[PDB]
Design a protein around this nucleic acid. Structure first.
Lengths: 141, 368, 58, 12, 94, 344, 58
RNA sequence: AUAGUCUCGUCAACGCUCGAGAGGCAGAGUCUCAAGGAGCCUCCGGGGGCUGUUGCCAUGAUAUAUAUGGAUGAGACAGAAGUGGCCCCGUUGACGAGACUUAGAUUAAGUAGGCCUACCGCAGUAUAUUCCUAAACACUAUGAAAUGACCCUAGUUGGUCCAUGAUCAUUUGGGUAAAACCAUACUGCAGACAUCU
């Protein structure tokens, strides 16, 4: 089938900057999937906003094909307030699939170290290098 | 050389692009072109921000959690005004169009009641249909005599979902309509979603904004001192009066009409074709401001034909009382009546007595 | 939700149940976003829309 | 402290 | 020292020997208004008022023996009640 | 076809026509077709002011070079600013503040006292300083130092070198805004400290640096050319008419017979109105022009569009400030049909 | 002086801190030359600019 | 006197989704729910499919629960708490209360006094002058430049300025310190509805 990267580009909101490249989008989706296996993830606007307000640190991934736009139009400047890097991807179905849920989600906040279990700590250690290189490539934009 | 030559090309006055109540101003028949403008008042689009908000309406997209009264109270809290209101009430689960009137615009709430409403509704059918088109036929069984008109937009039998547009008074009749569609189809059906696409004069395509827009515009004005966004989201109350027939008033008679006088022939400036006796009309100035909603006490041929009479009576006064100066009593017949009252040819109230000369009994007709 | 819409040539809404039309344009959700009167993010929304000229009247 | 005499002048 | 002092600013960072504060008070301070603690002891006076209307900052001119590096984030700085003037004055009149 | 027409006559066919017919009077001229004395006495120079002299010294220099009777400016007195300086000569001084609502634009270099840990923060700090702002005038400025609110409408960070510690940014600001205070505030929000290294005004009111900007060498060379050669072309090239300062104003075209009465202080009436803008509102500031495009006066509108279109008589405008001289046009009042009928 | 400029496609100035742009174009100084009211070289400047047509009046 | 308008609080009548709660919405705290797991089959420890229209949670709503939905959320604590956080029908008539008026809509160059003055419109002038002197800013005259000059607890190779004149010394001499508007006084020009064919 057609990939959701090329499919959802007409639906991308005008303020969806920075937008990930296809290789970067694949790396972000893989990192989100590994973090969801680590359970080091916040899904949806409510959880992401609450975690940002408490002071959690990580990476924010925002879907681009969001209608209406007032669902997510406060997230990027709120991430800038708390010094958290963010990046936009064009598809919310892919974000939900990588975020270990059946239905699509709007925004994902990877917070490393958010799981109390030791198995979650080991999974954090194994996806840590991918998370670090993704964050460096996002901040390089 | 570059000099504007005589009879050169230039823009001609096209009143079709004039805003709001000033649109098609050339269609109005002219009672008189001789008048003195008073440098008072403003255009409805050019009011200062206090008068613009105090005379403003908001076409709003209501969310699916709250009711209309709660949204109106929220808008009053956000804009920090004295009064807010609305005419068409939406149920909580319904989204769509809602007209919110602010302060002086709340005077027009009662008048716009009873206007037509248009909804777009999704009906969920409990079972699949043997024939799809029968649903449309079923809709034609329910349309008319109360649903005035309806149109089936789409119907997916695999999803068992049908979206259709209809015109009706309320949304509880939409629940009832979906239940009767289910019963006459025989499979049974209920309402999935409902949305009002038109409430009264305004629709969803006529500058609908959201509650986030209202909050952001108030925030921008408070913290940035920028009024453009607040002026964009808020429309004048004259937008609600475009359907009415218009009568244009001289500036000397505006304040007298605002206090409660009956508007008369010397005050009339322009009038519209098709004005019939006892029809509801709108009294406007030359700047397009709405003075009042009135009742036409004379017809169009009468307005063309008579030299004296009562033109209209104020049903609901819209304009503030002291926006225009008091210029009544300064006319020729008015000063003559004052002189007769002072000099004993009329009593203290102005009625005819024995000292009144017979020529005043002939030429003057008391409209009181 | 199920109610979707597109914009016609005149700019008015065309209502569909489809996520993607026959022409291939992705449809938009008709219902507005959830609002709370105690919302505290007008600054963030205004800043983001002002970075891209999306503020009405700008 | 005080205005100039040429600034505030009485009538003739 | 005045009997009643109101919380005026919160520490942000030092800047060239001055203390930058985000205003936690709705009103604008007087120029050279003294800045106090909860102990009513003066640490300095208001040097500069800056920033947008929604987010006002002010820098404090530190006195003798008062160092900007000695203070940490979250420290509150207090002003007298008469040293505040309403923000409506600086806005243009209608 | 009217887009190439100069100055205030540009796009004159968009004006609504009240009266299409008039009989011209062979008096006056176009602003570009004036004689050289009237051209200089009504002239405006968009000057590329250098860094070292102040604006007052530059205005005095232009007055001494061109042998004017007075010259003026309404620019901010920050030292070391280069770029746009609007110099009004003689009568044009009365229009020295006609474009204050347009604002100004600046390209500014900020020097930071220390290197930032994060580069992008500088841009973020600039985005914090956009909007209504609390500013106090610096010590160097002659304006009294009280706290005011000044609006920066839009700003953009052009470049930043963290090793050189220099940041070039463009700003659009309201008149009365100081960029020295803005650079100090940027340094205060960053925490490293900073100040204004260089400043350049790229737009002042309506005129910009691309709108025929000349240097002081151009003024002195053009005066030398006219003195020794009797050639006006270079002096006419560097000097612009005052009508350039009146763009963006709503225009009313006045009949020739009604011009000089307006110069004598009369109100403008409906029989003297010829053409007018769409959207003229009551109490707006407007410019009264002739058919030749020369400006009679700045006036205040007494009627709106419907009254301008459909009223047979009455006050159209009241003179706020008269630019044109008396008796440039003949006195033609008293000759109309209604006035002669009442006299008879 | 640090402020340099180059000419864009539209003819407006692009301001920069660099001597040479990334495309390789040499940037020009944005500030004007120093002026003295006692300068006595108008004849030389006018003659040289008339020799090459650089006079604005010409 | 009469009549109208605006702001209000009661009764009656007629309609409606039939209207005050164990209610709803917004917000705060705690907890639960997102196929994040398990098995199988392939491909090169990881990737892709199958179980899986499965499972987990909510929902009886005019209702198919073999159903409809699920973070652009739902449920429990909570029939609670709180409301000095908000919301809970419309039209007409009558009564009572407070106000504003009681209005015929003027003026093709003004207002007030005794033919003339004063105010009003526009345009100008003045708002200290001369001499000496202090200071600031910029220039200019003379001499000094590539081993150029200045600053910093000072350099694994610091930074800034610099013939487009830096930084030093003598004073060589002149320049700038405005303009616009308000207020007061004075002077002058007009009282103009704009024909021209």
């Amino acid at each position: 089938t057609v990939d959701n990267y090329e499919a959802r580009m007409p639906a991308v909101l005008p303020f969806a900057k920075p937008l990930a490249s296809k290789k970067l989008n694949k790396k972000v989706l893989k990192t989100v999937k590994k973090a969801s296996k680590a359970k080091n993830v916040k899904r949806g606007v409510k959880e992401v906003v609450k975690a940002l307000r408490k002071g959690e640190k990580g990476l924010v991934v925002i879907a681009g094909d969001i209608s209406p736009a007032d669902v997510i139009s406060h997230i990027p400047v709120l991430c800038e307030d708390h010094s958290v890097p963010y990046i936009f991807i064009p598809s919310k179905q892919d974000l939900g699939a990588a975020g270990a849920t059946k239905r699509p989600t709007s925004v994902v906040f990877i917070v490393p170290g958010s799981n109390k279990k030791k198995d979650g700590k080991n999974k954090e250690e194994e996806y840590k290098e991918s998370f670090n290189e993704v964050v460096k490539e996002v901040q390089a934009l | 050389d570059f000099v504007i030559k005589p009879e050169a090309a230039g823009a001609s006055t096209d009143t079709s692009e004039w805003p709001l109540l000033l649109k098609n101003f050339d269609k109005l028949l002219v009672r008189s072109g001789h008048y003195t403008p008073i440098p008072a008042g403003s255009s409805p689009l050019k009011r200062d921000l206090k008068s613009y908000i105090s005379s403003g309406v908001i076409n709003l997209d209501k969310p699916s959690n709250p009711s209309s009264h709660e949204v109106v109270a929220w808008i009053k809290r956000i804009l920090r005004c004295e009064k807010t209101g609305h005419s068409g009430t939406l149920d909580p689960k319904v989204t769509g169009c809602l007209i919110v009137c602010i302060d002086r615009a709340t005077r027009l709430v009662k008048s716009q009641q009873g206007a037509g409403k248009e909804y777009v509704c999704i009906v969920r059918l409990h079972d699949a249909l043997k024939d799809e088109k029968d649903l449309g036929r079923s809709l034609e069984n329910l349309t008319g005599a109360t649903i005035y008109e309806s149109n089936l937009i789409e119907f997916d039998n695999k999803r068992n979902l049908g979206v259709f547009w209809a015109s009706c008074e309320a949304g509880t009749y939409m629940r009832t309509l979906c239940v009767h569609l289910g019963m006459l189809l025989g499979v049974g059906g209920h309402m999935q979603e409902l949305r009002r696409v038109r409430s009264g004069a305004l629709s969803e395509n006529d500058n609908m904004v959201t509650l986030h827009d209202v909050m952001d515009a108030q925030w921008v004005y408070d913290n940035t001192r920028d009024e453009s966004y607040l002026r964009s989201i808020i429309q004048p109350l004259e937008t609600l009066l475009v359907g009415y027939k218009r009568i244009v008033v001289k500036d000397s008679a505006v304040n007298a009409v605002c206090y409660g006088a009956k508007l008369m022939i010397p005050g009339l400036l322009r009038y519209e074709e098709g004005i019939e006796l006892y029809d509801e009309i709108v009294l406007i100035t030359t700047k397009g401001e709405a003075i009042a909603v009135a009742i036409a006490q004379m017809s169009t041929v009468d307005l063309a034909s008579c030299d004296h009479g009562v033109v209209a009576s104020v049903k609901r006064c819209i304009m503030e009382r002291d926006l225009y100066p008091r210029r009544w009593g300064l006319g020729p017949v008015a000063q003559k009546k004052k002189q007769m009252k002072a000099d004993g040819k009329l009593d203290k109230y102005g009625r005819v007595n024995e000292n009144t000369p017979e020529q005043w009994k002939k030429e003057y007709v008391p409209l009181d | 939700m199920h109610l979707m819409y597109t914009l016609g040539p005149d700019g008015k809404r065309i209502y569909t149940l489809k996520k993607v039309t026959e022409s291939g344009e992705i449809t938009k959700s008709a219902h507005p976003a959830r609002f709370s009167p105690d919302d505290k993010y007008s600054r963030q929304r205004v800043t983001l829309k002002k970075r891209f000229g999306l503020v009405p009247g700008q | 402290k005080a205005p100039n005499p040429l600034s505030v002048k009485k009538k003739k | 020292p005045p009997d009643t002092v109101l919380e005026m600013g919160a520490f942000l960072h030092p800047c060239e020997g001055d203390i930058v504060c985000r205003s936690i008070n709705t009103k604008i301070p007087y120029f050279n208004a003294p800045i106090y603690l909860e102990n009513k002891t003066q640490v300095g006076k208001v040097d500069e008022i800056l920033g947008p209307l929604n987010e006002v900052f002010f820098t404090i001119k530190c006195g003798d023996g008062v160092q900007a590096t000695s203070f940490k984030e979250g420290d509150k700085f207090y002003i007298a009640a008469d040293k505040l003037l309403p923000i409506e004055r600086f806005l243009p009149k209608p």
